[PDB]
């Protein structure tokens, strides 16, 4: 585990709430305001859940392995309904639960490059008080390409070869703005921010 | 890695023929020939897929944490067809990828005899069989119904802290569905006919 987590004394997940002015903090609002600089931030929480991360780290290892030197992770956002937070804090991204998008690129689940998509209503739905969440995320999207609606996977790399298999899939690879994770632990919640119009 | 496993030569996949006649081969046989001793055994691999297991036994030891002195590993079988199978020997089972009157999940039977049935273990072009003999993580289990996408949850007022897979009967089960990724390792592949 991370050393500069809060101790859980044997605990196995915890929400820590950030301090304003802490580099910690400044940076996620920095990130989050680039897009989303109408709205209000309530609150960032670091999410600390032990086994995500155990499971997590394992997968990048192993992309870390199989790749030629990439940049695996990148730290995307995540916007989603009130009901569905407990859940994602305690077990992550499930493409199962996972609906169609509106421009869908494949059954997964769906991460934005920019706070201002995640920030959607029909994402991050805002709760009976007004509130909305999203998360920012570690996601492992490794070597991509642009998806296709109907993907129950990331397509192969070489169709004479169909179980070699991309990493993850965008809408455009030249440009992207979102990416379609279709494994469980490839993407770890790493922050939870409340926030409001 | 486990001791059993040949020797990699530095590769992080292979599938190893077993030996007929030694330890292992008759162990795995065995488990086969209880219900399905009619049938013909071409052969039989072990599946050495070192980032499946690793990704394996790390969910095994959260269960093994989570459940506090539990038996939460059960070898099961897995009928499949012949072009499901280097996806399954590379990625393991996939709940996205038959009848789920249990749930949208993968499943395992307890009787070899279940997955020797054509409609999971269809017979190829040549009339060849394929089954998987799997380690899954059946942990805490109740009884499955239609649509579920994850387990139950063990008590509604804490609806995150779920059983860890459904089965048909929970005093007698022949068959256990799993939901997440990582919950099976296939441990050997059992090619044969009818
Ligand atoms: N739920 C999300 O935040 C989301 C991100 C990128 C998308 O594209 C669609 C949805
Ligand atoms: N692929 C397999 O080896 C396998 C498939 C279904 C299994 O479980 C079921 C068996 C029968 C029924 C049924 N409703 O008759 C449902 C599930 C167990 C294993």
Redesign the pocket.
């Known amino acids: 585990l991370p050393e500069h987590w809060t101790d859980m004394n044997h605990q196995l997940f915890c929400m820590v709430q950030l301090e304003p002015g802490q580099s910690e903090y400044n940076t996620i609002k920095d990130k989050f305001t680039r897009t989303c600089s109408s709205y209000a931030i309530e609150k960032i929480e670091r999410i600390q859940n032990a086994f995500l991360w155990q499971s997590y780290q394992v997968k990048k290892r192993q992309m870390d392995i199989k790749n030629d030197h990439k940049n695996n992770e990148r730290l995307?956002?995540?916007?989603?309904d009130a009901d569905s937070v407990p859940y994602v804090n305690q077990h992550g991204f499930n493409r199962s639960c996972a609906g169609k998008?509106?421009?869908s690129?494949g059954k997964g689940?769906?991460?934005?490059?920019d706070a201002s998509?995640?920030?959607?209503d029909?994402?991050?739905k805002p709760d009976s008080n007004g509130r909305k969440h999203?998360?920012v995320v570690r996601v492992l999207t490794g070597v991509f390409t642009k998806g296709r609606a109907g993907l129950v996977t990331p397509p192969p790399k070489n169709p004479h070869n169909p179980t070699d298999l991309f990493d993850s899939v965008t809408?455009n690879t030249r440009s992207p703005?979102?990416?379609?994770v279709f494994f469980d632990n490839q993407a770890y919640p790493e922050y939870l921010i409340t926030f409001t119009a």
């Open positions: 995307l956002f995540h916007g989603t998008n509106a421009v690129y689940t769906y991460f934005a490059v998509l995640s920030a959607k029909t994402y991050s999203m998360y809408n703005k979102l990416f379609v």
